[PDB]
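User: Can you predict the 3D structure of conserved hypothetical protein? Sequence below.
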Amino acid sequence: ALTLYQRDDCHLCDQAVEALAQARAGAFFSVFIDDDAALESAYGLRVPVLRDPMGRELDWPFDAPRLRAWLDAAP
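Assistant: Sure. Here are the predicted structure tokens for conserved hypothetical protein:
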């Protein structure tokens, strides 16, 4: 499963969600940075950001082909 770091009320984050569906990425779980100072400082200017089990990260912007390619480029 992937980890999608995002914040509440963000069009870019909603778009990442759609990219995950269109690229047919597998399972993913959202982690909202809003109430986490540490996550805010680390991803506050980058969200939405995708992170895989290996620890690799893909920062917005990314469309279906970039996402699907990033996934297939692992590990």
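Helices lie at 11-22, 37-43, 64-72. The chain has one domain: 1-75.
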